[PDB]
Enzyme design. Structure first.
Site, PDB file in Angstrom:
ATOM      1  N   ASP A   1       0.789  -1.276  -0.080  1.00 22.08           N
ATOM      2  CA  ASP A   1       0.048   0.007  -0.041  1.00 22.08           C
ATOM      3  C   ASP A   1       1.054   1.137   0.159  1.00 22.08           C
ATOM      4  O   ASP A   1       1.769   1.580   1.064  1.00 22.08           O
ATOM      5  CB  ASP A   1      -0.671  -0.254   1.105  1.00 22.08           C
ATOM      6  CG  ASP A   1      -2.345   0.972   1.083  1.00 22.08           C
ATOM      7  OD1 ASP A   1      -2.645   0.766   0.500  1.00 22.08           O
ATOM      8  OD2 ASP A   1      -1.796   1.642   2.329  1.00 22.08           O
TER       9      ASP A   1
ATOM     10  N   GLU B   1       1.331  -0.175  -4.621  1.00 19.12           N
ATOM     11  CA  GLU B   1       0.870   1.578  -5.914  1.00 19.12           C
ATOM     12  C   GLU B   1       2.200   2.270  -5.709  1.00 19.12           C
ATOM     13  O   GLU B   1       2.278   2.457  -4.693  1.00 19.12           O
ATOM     14  CB  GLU B   1      -0.230   1.771  -4.641  1.00 19.12           C
ATOM     15  CG  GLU B   1      -1.370   1.264  -5.160  1.00 19.12           C
ATOM     16  CD  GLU B   1      -2.285   1.853  -3.746  1.00 19.12           C
ATOM     17  OE1 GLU B   1      -2.064   2.011  -2.252  1.00 19.12           O
ATOM     18  OE2 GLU B   1      -3.720   2.451  -3.539  1.00 19.12           O
TER      19      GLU B   1
END
Ligand SMILES: [Ca+2]
Ligand SMILES: [Ca+2]
Ligand SMILES: [Ca+2]
Ligand SMILES: [Ca+2]
Ligand SMILES: [Cl-]
Ligand SMILES: [Cl-]
Ligand SMILES: [Cl-]
Ligand SMILES: [Cl-]
Ligand SMILES: [Cl-]
Length: 775
Positions: free
Chosen positions: A418, A447
């Site tokens: 994340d 990400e």
């Protein structure tokens, strides 16, 4: 106007003192340094930095006689140890956490906390977590590691299942902290937080003794690299919280044990890897309330995606059938993972090292160290908690040690990071190196948004999309292919390729080759291809929003467009990513009576998007992190009930067949950019037939290692289109149609729908995908 502000010790013989301003003889007058007992220390020399208004002070500054008092004109300040200097003095490579012996009669415990005056363990009854049963003081070593051995002296015969906190004293203040290396926890309800105890309690467990003892890494057929992965993103609650499953399900809804009862569906679907949303302990939750939230709401639900990290080693009790038994969840996740591996699939864990739920979680343990910091020493913060500073040695250890523990203990096959762009590339590189050393088939993604903050004034190379040109380790999500095909940030709902907005075909084509326009990918494995995920509107809902049509009357058109999107992702180079429910057309429509029709700006529902064309229930949720089970559940009827839901089941069978096609041939899974540019070509070049520079139809050809040829045609236009082949692609007219308007797979379709063969062209129906194979 010259006044002393603060000071830090940066090495054995150097202290930097910050001033209001410095605009040498006249200051080595007034400046004096003393030790912890007020005794004078000799200044060897000083250096003035007038630009930064800091004074570098040299001398013999033994940290054992520290901290030092710097004084100037009435201001007296105490020196703070910089994190670099704290690493120099206290960086530790030994075991951290609490280890039970075989029979549970003894625990060896270790906690790193170099600035503590004292550390005391408080032990709580296994069968009553609020009941204090013993306390014992730890002893500190030279690296600031506090240690003890629990045994018969505390009146406890077997420590298994007992809980513990650490009370740290620094001067007058005392605080109770959570062992960051805790392998399990007591059942957690954040409503119980007070001023004294504001974390979950750690638990004494022995991971190696729990779950299937032959647990092994995945055995995925014909999986030779990250480009062969087909990832499926699911939340453990979502996947089995459907009321439809009541009376089906042998285990409790929304648990690891229930999830296993639905793996056959995913085995059939054909995905290689199941990605689970954060299963590590998160803060805002009541694990003792497993009740279904049946009202359609977008706020104030016990539901949580899990992006509020409490622990990086200890699992959440939310997905356990027995949260009051800390050993159960370890056994339950291992069993689910063993059940995944049995079906030829792998597991990937979503992990959230970018921030913690509460800054105090780590700041209480050791101040001015664990988090990325401002120059004044204060912690930088994100999403209501602390930014873990993974350039700092023991903070890097937390990330890397947890990745190693999860990999080797639970036999995890990959990880998703994340906000990976918050991290330094060095920490993620190391995490990959260590994980890959344990598991040679390890894959990682994350990400890679350009979000890096780091330590103030201390630039570092971040682990984001620009890192892809200098590494072939971790792959990043391609927001470019997402946006181009169906919109996204900053303009979600804007017409794009599959929703009536003409796009430059060269850019689309380059995306199909795993060459996004917003970052340099020097290898196809750098790119994770996707059009939907748990975040933002679902693929179905964003399509309906983008074309502005009511699903009550336009369900069929929406799914025709949805299927085009799935075709493009599953025939594109790189790593293919599918959101759970993307296969059937999952929706997050707010079916709440209070929002039957459009309401005022003042009374808007939280995190909702209005589709103007919808008459009844016009709001759809684009951020369902705090939404009910009514919003968040996987719709099993829509996914599997052929009779009641023929459109969504046709779409899921279409998606299942596209996965088979993808895995059947390396034409869609090439290893290098070099061979992609040479073997994947654009049929619809600008000026061929009626093809324009920006358009809504595209066609491309790829060839596999056997040289077998595959050609993919996508007419996303709302009228029929003739695609010119000419002398260059005329050989395709002799091929077999394996994907048409109705079905997808690897077998020849005898009477194909949506396509007509001409002399040197193809006539393709509106909103239709055609794939031809020439053997
Ligand atoms: Ca299948
Ligand atoms: Ca218990
Ligand atoms: Ca690369
Ligand atoms: Ca919540
Ligand atoms: Cl448990
Ligand atoms: Cl996003
Ligand atoms: Cl629909
Ligand atoms: Cl979706
Ligand atoms: Cl239907």
């Amino acid at each position: 106007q010259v006044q002393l502000k603060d000071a830090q010790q940066t090495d054995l013989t150097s202290i930097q003192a910050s001033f209001t301003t410095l605009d040498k003889t006249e200051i080595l007058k007034e400046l004096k340094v003393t030790d912890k007992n007020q005794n004078a220390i000799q200044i060897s020399d000083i250096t003035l930095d007038t630009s930064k208004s800091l004074l570098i002070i040299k001398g013999d500054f033994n940290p054992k006689q520290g901290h030092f008092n710097i004084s100037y004109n009435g201001n007296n300040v105490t020196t703070r140890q910089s994190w670099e200097f704290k690493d120099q003095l206290y960086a530790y490579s030994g075991n951290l956490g609490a280890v039970l012996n075989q029979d549970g009669s003894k625990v060896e415990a270790s906690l790193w906390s170099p600035s503590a005056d004292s550390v005391t363990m408080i032990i709580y009854d296994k069968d009553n977590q609020n009941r204090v049963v013993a306390t014992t003081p730890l002893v500190k070593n030279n690296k600031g590691v506090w240690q003890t051995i629990l045994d018969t002296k505390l009146g406890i015969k077997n420590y298994t299942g007992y809980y513990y906190l650490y009370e740290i004293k620094r001067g007058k203040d005392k605080v109770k902290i959570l062992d960051p290396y805790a392998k399990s926890l007591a059942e957690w309800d954040s409503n119980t937080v007070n001023d004294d105890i504001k974390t979950a309690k750690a638990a004494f467990v022995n991971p190696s003794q729990l779950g299937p003892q032959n647990l092994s890494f995945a055995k995925i057929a014909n999986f030779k690299g990250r480009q062969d992965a087909v990832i499926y993103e699911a939340h453990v609650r979502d996947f089995t919280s459907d009321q439809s499953l009541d009376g089906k399900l042998k285990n409790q809804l929304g648990t690891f044990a229930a999830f296993s009862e639905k793996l056959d569906y995913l085995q059939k679907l054909g995905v290689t890897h199941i990605q689970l949303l954060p299963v590590l302990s998160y803060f805002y939750v009541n694990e003792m309330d497993k009740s279904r939230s049946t009202a359609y709401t977008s706020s104030d639900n016990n539901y949580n995606w899990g992006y509020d990290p409490q622990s990086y080693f200890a699992l959440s009790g939310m997905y356990s059938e027995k949260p009051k038994d800390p050993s159960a969840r370890i056994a339950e996740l291992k069993q689910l993972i063993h059940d995944i591996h049995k079906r030829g699939m792998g597991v990937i864990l979503d992990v959230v090292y970018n921030h913690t739920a509460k800054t105090y979680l780590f700041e209480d343990i050791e101040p001015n160290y664990y988090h990325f910091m401002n120059e004044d020493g204060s912690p930088r913060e994100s999403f209501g908690g602390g930014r873990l500073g993974t350039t700092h040695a023991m903070s890097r250890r937390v990330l890397v040690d947890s990745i190693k523990y999860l990999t080797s203990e639970f036999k995890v096959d990959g990880f998703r990071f994340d906000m990976m762009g918050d991290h330094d590339a060095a920490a993620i590189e190391l995490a990959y190196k260590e994980a890959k050393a344990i598991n040679p088939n390890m894959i990682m993604i994350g990400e890679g948004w350009r979000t890096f903050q780091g330590d103030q004034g201390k630039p570092v190379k971040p682990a984001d999309q620009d890192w892809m040109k200098s590494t072939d380790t971790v792959g990043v999500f391609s927001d470019d292919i997402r946006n181009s095909l169906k919109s996204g940030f900053p303009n979600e709902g804007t017409p794009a390729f599959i929703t009536g907005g003409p796009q430059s075909l060269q850019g689309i084509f380059k995306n199909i080759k795993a060459q996004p326009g917003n970052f340099e990918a020097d290898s196809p494995g750098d790119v994770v291809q996707y059009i939907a995920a748990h975040d933002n509107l679902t693929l179905h809902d964003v399509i309906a929003k983008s074309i502005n049509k009511d699903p009550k009357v336009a369900e069929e058109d929406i799914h025709r467009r949805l299927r085009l999107g799935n075709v493009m992702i599953l025939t594109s180079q790189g790593t293919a990513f599918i959101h759970s429910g993307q296969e059937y057309g999952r929706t997050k429509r707010l079916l709440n009576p209070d929002y039957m029709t459009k309401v005022s700006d003042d009374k808007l529902p939280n995190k909702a998007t209005l589709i103007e064309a919808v008459k009844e229930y016009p709001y759809f949720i684009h951020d369902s992190y705090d939404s009910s089970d009514a919003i968040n559940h996987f719709d099993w009827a829509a996914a599997t009930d052929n009779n009641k839901h023929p459109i969504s089941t046709k779409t899921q069978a279409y998606t299942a067949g596209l996965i088979t096609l993808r895995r059947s041939t390396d034409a869609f899974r090439k290893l290098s950019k070099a061979e992609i540019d040479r073997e994947v070509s654009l049929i619809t070049e600008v000026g061929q037939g009626d093809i324009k520079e920006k358009d809504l139809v595209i066609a491309y050809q790829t060839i596999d290692s056997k040289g077998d040829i595959y050609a993919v045609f996508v007419n996303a236009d709302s009228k029929a289109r003739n695609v010119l082949l000419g002398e260059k692609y005329k050989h395709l007219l002799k091929g077999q149609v394996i994907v048409d308007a109705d079905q997808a797979g690897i077998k020849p379709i005898s009477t194909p729908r949506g396509v007509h063969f001409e002399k040197d062209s193809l006539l393709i129906d509106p909103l239709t995908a055609i794939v031809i194979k020439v053997g």
